[PDB]
């Protein structure tokens, strides 16, 4: 909750008199956070998919929606409509609180904590993080862990290019 | 020898009434697959995409925008 307050009270003036924006709404902000998982290995056993589903529901606060395959690639022993993956979309208070938790207590848990990648930008102002260990987030426990598997947290920002997104993220604390 | 040799029979498609002709209601004006001619005013599209007159009048083959046509019937 607070992180939004500091964003709109101190980071906003900094972006103002750092980028010389014409009007107020030209300052970039964070639009949504989308988290994705892949269960392509759950082609036969459909229960590990479910386990990951309650994992995501527990870890975010909202139940994910199960995603279905759009093709029937034979290389991956696939048929169209097979349920693969899940996603949770954060928009508003949940987004800010989750990002605050991620930056202040989740990141200082990776086994080799040297710093997030400085070249993980899609080229248009959106950052994609690639944590690949389950209980990097403190909420879930080691005993409840049934299969170590990664995650894809994606941050979507209104900035029009990479660099100002970089400074916005550093201002937030990434 | 000659694995070919089969063909269907022709369905007599085309236009059955001319532009400017007085037409009785309910009579077919254009037989066709799909929609080559759209139904205009006072004409309707049938089950197999034929166009028929919904009232007595004078046939007029008109033009919609750049690349489409339509047929309509105008009472005299």
């Amino acid at each position: 909750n607070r992180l939004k307050d500091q964003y709109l009270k101190e980071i906003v003036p900094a972006l103002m008199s750092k980028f010389n924006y014409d009007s107020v709404m030209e300052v970039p902000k964070i639009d949504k956070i989308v988290i994705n998982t892949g269960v392509g290995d759950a082609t036969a056993n459909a229960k590990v998919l479910d386990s990951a589903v309650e994992e995501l529901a527990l870890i975010t606060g909202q139940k994910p929606v199960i995603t279905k395959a759009k093709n029937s690639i034979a290389g991956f022993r696939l048929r169209e409509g097979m349920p693969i993956g899940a996603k949770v979309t954060l928009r508003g208070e949940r987004m800010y609180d989750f990002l605050d938790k991620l930056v202040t207590v989740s990141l200082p848990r990776v086994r080799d904590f040297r710093g997030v990648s400085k070249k993980a930008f899609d080229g248009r102002g959106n950052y994609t993080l690639g944590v690949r260990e389950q209980l990097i987030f403190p909420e879930i426990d080691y005993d409840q862990v049934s299969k170590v598997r990664g995650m894809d947290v994606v941050i979507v920002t209104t900035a029009k290019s990479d660099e100002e997104s970089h400074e916005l993220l550093t201002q937030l604390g990434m | 020898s000659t694995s070919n040799g089969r063909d269907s029979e022709s369905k007599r498609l085309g236009a059955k009434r001319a532009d400017g002709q007085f037409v009785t209601g309910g009579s077919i004006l254009y037989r066709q697959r799909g929609t080559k001619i759209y139904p205009g005013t006072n004409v309707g599209r049938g089950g197999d995409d034929t166009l028929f007159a919904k009232t007595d009048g004078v046939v007029r083959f008109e033009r919609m925008g750049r690349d489409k046509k339509k047929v309509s019937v105008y009472p005299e």
Binding site: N1, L58, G61, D97, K101, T104, V105, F113, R114 | -
Partner: protein
Amino acid sequence: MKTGIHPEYRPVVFVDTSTDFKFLSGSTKSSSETIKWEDGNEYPLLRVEISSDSHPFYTGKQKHATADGRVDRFNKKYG
């Protein structure tokens, strides 16, 4: 916010046992505790390991280690 299909998300207050660093951010896990902070935030006192205030990349960790000189060590060891 569809009802009856979401897990509980009651607020919680974080505390860092490493350096007594208070923090407030609601979490799904109940953790079976109770503590009120900042003019009233009665919620679980969720303990945690090191936070960003002590991690290497997330804080100003200075050395936590040393270096080598080899030829210096050879000169020091041999004499």
